[PDB]
């Protein structure tokens, strides 16, 4: 299926990396109009071009939990596992906040602790208003560094459980650099 985690993609917090978003909710997006038109057949350098078109964070929202683009795009990467550099280029990036957005969450989801910290840190910087959409279909106002600061401290964000980080420097694949 095209759904399915990509082959060359190595295993996340110990488990397929998509399995980070709950069941039903991976269910939902891969029943939304936004995930068959604009997700499908999105590579890693493809992701930006629909990054960049995004106007809001958010997870789910309504009683049938109907998925954000932010969300789709999320789970995507989460399945096409992006080199790093790709990552820490939406972090680095100044132009687009949602872009910026996008990455520090999915650098949550996916890297160390000292990843987290080396890149997701200098963003308490930025305090730049964003759309976040809530549970109930409403748009609210945040900052980004609010946002960043969730990322570092809370428990959940986007509707996404944020896995244990890992304290030990560790590296997976036998390729990756040594900082």
Same mark, same amino acid.
């Given at each position: 299926m095209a759904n399915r985690t990509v082959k060359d993609a190595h295993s996340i917090h110990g488990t #397929?990396?998509? /399995? *980070?978003? !709950?069941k039903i909710i991976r269910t939902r997006i891969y029943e939304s109009k936004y995930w068959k038109e !604009?997700?499908?057949? *999105?590579?890693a350098e493809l992701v930006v071009d629909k990054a960049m078109e995004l106007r809001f964070v958010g997870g789910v929202y309504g009683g049938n939990i109907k998925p954000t683009p932010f969300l789709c795009l999320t789970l995507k990467m989460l399945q096409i596992q992006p080199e790093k550099d790709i990552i820490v280029e939406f972090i680095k990036n100044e132009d687009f906040k949602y872009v910026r957005m996008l990455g520090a969450l999915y650098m949550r989801l996916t890297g160390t602790a000292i990843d987290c910290y080396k890149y *997701?840190?200098?963003? /308490? #910087?930025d305090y730049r208003k964003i759309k976040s959409q809530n549970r109930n279909g409403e748009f609210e106002l945040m900052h980004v560094d609010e946002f960043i600061d969730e990322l570092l401290h809370?428990?959940?964000v986007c509707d996404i459980i944020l896995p244990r980080l890992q304290?030990? /420097?560790? *590296?997976?694949?036998?390729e990756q650099l040594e900082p």
């Open positions: #397929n990396p998509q /399995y *980070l978003v !709950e !604009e997700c499908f057949g *999105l590579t *997701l840190e200098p963003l /308490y #910087n809370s428990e959940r304290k030990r /420097y560790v *590296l997976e694949e036998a």
